[PDB]
């Protein structure tokens, strides 16, 4: 199995200005590996959760935005950058998931929002949420 590792850091500025609706989606800019294979990825966040059951959480997904092949398998890992600059609260997929164009995989309940908004945890310094994604794609 041939594997390409790559990563993306996303800073969401003005986090408290997100819309107060569970529908709302925010997406990152697209990013890619160096393998030069026409794959484009982005991150997707539901700041107020995906749906009623998850409304207390922030949801976080990896989306394969563009891919001219039938499928690609990839492992992934998300983390939050704290006010010290270190990664915290990471979660990984453990195994590789099958992506096709337009498909996303991730965590409906990535982190409870009240924890996020709790000043003492230092995860929204300056009203900014910084997320780090590591991806390992099978080539």
């Amino acid at each position: 199995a041939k594997v390409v590792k790559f990563s993306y850091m996303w800073t969401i500025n003005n986090f408290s200005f997100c819309r107060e609706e569970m529908g709302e989606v925010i997406k990152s800019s697209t990013f890619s590996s160096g393998a030069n294979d026409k794959l484009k990825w982005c991150l997707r966040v539901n700041p107020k959760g995906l749906d009623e059951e998850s409304k207390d959480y922030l949801s976080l997904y990896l989306l394969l935005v563009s891919c001219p092949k039938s499928e690609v398998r990839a492992k992934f890992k998300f983390s939050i950058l704290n006010a010290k600059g270190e990664e915290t609260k990471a979660m990984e997929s453990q195994r590789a998931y099958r992506f096709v164009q337009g498909k996303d995989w991730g965590f409906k309940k990535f982190i409870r929002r009240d924890f996020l908004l709790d000043e003492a945890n230092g995860l929204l310094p300056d009203d900014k949420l910084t997320l780090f994604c590591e991806v390992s794609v099978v080539q």
Binding site: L50, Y61, M91, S93, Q94, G106, F107, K108, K109
Partner: peptide
């Protein structure tokens, strides 16, 4: 009360 994070992986489909 509720877990801080749930490591269950799924695909963005609202319920």
């Amino acid at each position: 009360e509720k877990p801080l994070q749930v490591a269950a992986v799924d695909s963005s489909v609202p319920r």
